[PDB]
């Protein structure tokens, strides 16, 4: 399913993945295409602390959704 | 010297004046120079100087709009002076004439003014008129307000505010104030008396300081009703350029 992910700065990328798919899959995909481990990644939607243990269906996400990614960097 | 003869300009630009090479040499002018031109009724304008040898020595060419603004006719004399201290217009607010804009759809600014001012650097002064010929239409406008005042150069970055209600044309004509002495006839004696009694105290106050006297202040006109007393007062006030109240 088409969706949009915007990082903290504002850089945006379009992803395709099923709503039933677990968000952990999207986090692993983001890691693969950005080398960012999921621990540093944190995805938010409407002020919800989305975690790798849930799927977008539980959060009730739909297509072209805007997901805000934040880097809990591991450099400190 | 600077008493250049008025003539009809070939170009339709509203801020371009063509001058003779000999006069340009006399006044040390050059092509592209912005100069302040004064005609009649104390009217002033800013014109871009262009060398033109076709005109006879001591003659200049200006278009219809500039002459209308200056309230002068072809064949008259205009005084041209340097205007080197003209700054770029920070913000110009301009409104069109209603009758001209009738039957126009879309944003008038983009249609007419946007190509007119971009890469043009046309000087603009308050109370002036400029006409834009776009497509099959020709529309006149007014220099309603200029920042910095009272005049400035409209640069590429200059902001233009075209928003505002249409301006009726009837106001300019039917309110024909600024009437000069040419609108009063048959009373030259009294007109001369009022002029010699008003202009000199105001236009040349230093005279009385040199002679060390207090000029007379009060004046009282009287006569049969309908003899143009108000008209004479208005004409004298407008010609003197004082703050009429």
């Amino acid at each position: 399913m088409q969706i949009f992910v915007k990082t903290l700065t504002g850089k945006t990328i379009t992803l395709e993945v099923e709503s039933s798919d677990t968000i952990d899959n999207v986090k692993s995909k983001i890691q693969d295409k950005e080398g960012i481990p999921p621990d540093q990644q944190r995805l938010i939607f409407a002020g919800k602390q989305l975690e790798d243990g849930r799927t977008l269906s539980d959060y009730n996400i739909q297509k072209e959704s805007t997901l805000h990614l934040v880097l809990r960097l591991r450099g400190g | 010297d600077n008493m250049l003869l008025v003539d009809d300009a070939i170009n339709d630009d509203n801020s371009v004046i063509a001058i003779n090479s000999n006069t340009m040499d006399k006044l040390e002018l050059f092509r592209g120079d912005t100069v302040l031109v004064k005609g009649k009724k104390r009217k002033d304008t800013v014109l871009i100087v262009l060398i033109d040898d076709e005109l006879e020595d001591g003659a200049c060419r200006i278009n219809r709009v500039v002459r209308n603004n200056l309230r002068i006719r072809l064949g008259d004399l205009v005084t041209i002076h340097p205007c080197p201290d003209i700054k770029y217009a920070t913000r110009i607010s301009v409104l069109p004439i209603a009758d001209t804009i009738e039957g126009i759809t879309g944003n008038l600014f983009d249609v007419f003014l946007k190509p007119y001012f971009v890469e043009a650097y046309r000087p603009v002064r308050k109370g002036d008129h400029f006409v834009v010929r776009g497509g099959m239409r020709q529309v006149e406008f007014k220099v309603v307000d200029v920042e910095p005042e009272e005049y400035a150069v409209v640069a590429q970055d200059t902001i233009i505010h075209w928003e505002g209600e249409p301006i009726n044309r009837e106001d300019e004509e039917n309110n024909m104030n600024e009437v000069g002495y040419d609108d009063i006839g048959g009373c030259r004696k009294q007109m001369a008396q009022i002029r010699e009694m008003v202009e000199l105290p105001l236009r040349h106050p230093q005279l009385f300081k040199a002679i060390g006297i207090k000029p007379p202040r009060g004046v009282l006109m009287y006569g049969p009703p309908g003899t143009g007393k108000t008209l004479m007062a208005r004409a004298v006030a407008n010609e003197t350029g004082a703050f009429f109240f």
Binding site: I44, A46, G47, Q49, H68, V70 | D171, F243, F245
Partner: protein, 474 residues
Amino acid sequence: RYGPLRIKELAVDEELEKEDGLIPRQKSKLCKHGDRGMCEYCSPLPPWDKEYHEKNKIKHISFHSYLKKLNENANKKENGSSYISPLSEPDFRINKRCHNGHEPWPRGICSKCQPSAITLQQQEFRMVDHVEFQKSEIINEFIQAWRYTGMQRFGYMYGSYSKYDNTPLGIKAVVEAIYEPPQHDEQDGLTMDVEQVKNEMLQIDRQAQEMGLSRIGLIFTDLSDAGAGDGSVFCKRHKDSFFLSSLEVIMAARHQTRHPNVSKYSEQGFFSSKFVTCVISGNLEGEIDISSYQVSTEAEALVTADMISGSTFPSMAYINDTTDERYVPEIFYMKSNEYGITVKENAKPAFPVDYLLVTLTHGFPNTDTETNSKFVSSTGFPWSNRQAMGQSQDYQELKKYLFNVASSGDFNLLHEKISNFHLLLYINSLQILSPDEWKLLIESAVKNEWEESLLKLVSSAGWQTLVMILQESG
């Protein structure tokens, strides 16, 4: 300047000026004419028509309407003048330099620079019409201050102005928050050094402007407890008694003179500050009703040249004496009798202040409308200068108040806790946050569409340091 003055003022003034406010009227049964053509009763009613106001129980005429009346009364177009500014703030101070042949006032005066007799009269136009409190908590906390301590209070009220449809060309001041300056309150009165107050308020108002607020009045409580079982308070301010004693009137006049309202229709450019003063006294019953007032323009220009002082009579203001640098002409106050004739009475020893006031209508926003409150807050982090009570801003209260919310997430809950006026002021005072970081903080806390800005804020290292030190601190 060959026309009206050129200057930029508040947006409310501009939008009000654009309107004309005419109240249409339909064919009256007394008309004698065809459908088209209106004779005398079908004409639109001007916005300044006093009959309509007094018929609708409105005691004053919505200043902008007064400006329209003045403009219509004169200033014919295309001729008749070169524009005369219709509004001029009266000045009573003697011209220090007139010199028709005489020397300055201390040892010489003529009849051209002698302040003429002043005719006090109730003003007819009130600048600001409706003072509106966004939420009951904003003033409930203020009164809770008195409840806890028992002493009086005093605090400025920041807010913004807007239209007011309920009155012809009326204005309303919506107050958003209340800031309490350092003052020494007491049973019968309150005191505060002016220097500290102004020095603090300069920076506080700078920060508020950065936030988009503005100082729009002062509010103080004059409350006493009754002998009833519950909490009841006497009504010491009614028709018979004094609505506002001399001293509060003087202070309000000074405040107005120091908060001028910029206007385009005066030679100086200012006229009749849009400053509103609210007092809490209690209605005829035991309630804690509030009120609003505003001293007229003459009183605004009267206190500047001294000429007034408090009197042991609460309802009357003493008049000073002539002396060098202060010339006080005879003051006649004009009233109306029961026979419809105006009477001028000389009152040198003392005169009532009822002629130096205009009353506004307080109220609260309709409880069935859209909510545009800047701050969903004011029940939380204790307000600034409540040292006298136990409330005290410091790290420990921040730890107790705004730690668990941030340490986990739930940004929806966080936003409201971050949109508290005093919280923002305190965190800015700490100076931990960087300037731009604080700017985006306030933009997130006082504006909608805040998700991205809030996420960026929690991203910035400043907030990380803030939360880290807060957690580490006890």
